[PDB]
Amino acid sequence: SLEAAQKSNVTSSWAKASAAWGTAGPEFFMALFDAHDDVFAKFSGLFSGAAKGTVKNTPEMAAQAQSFKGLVSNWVDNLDNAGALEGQCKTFAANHKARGISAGQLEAAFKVLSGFMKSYGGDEGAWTAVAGALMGEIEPDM
* Binding site per annotation, positions for heme b: 96
| Closest residue by Cα to residue 66 from 118, 10, 109, 22 | 22
**Min. distance of Cβ 101 from ligand HEM in angstroms?**
5
Q: How far apart are CA 5 and CA 99, in angstroms?
A: 36
Q: Judged by CB, which is closer to ligand HEM: 4, or 100?
A: 100
Q: Contacts from 96-100 at CB under 8 Å and sequence distance 24+?
A: 96/142, 97/141, 97/142, 99/42, 100/42
Q: Judged by CB, which is closer to ligand HEM: 9, or 25?
A: 25
Binder of ligand HEM out of 6, 9, 105, 114 (CB under 6 A): 105
> What is the footprint of ligand HEM within residues 36-95 (CB under 6 A)?
39, 42-43, 45-46, 67-68, 71-72, 95
**Min. distance of Cβ 41 from ligand HEM in angstroms?**
8
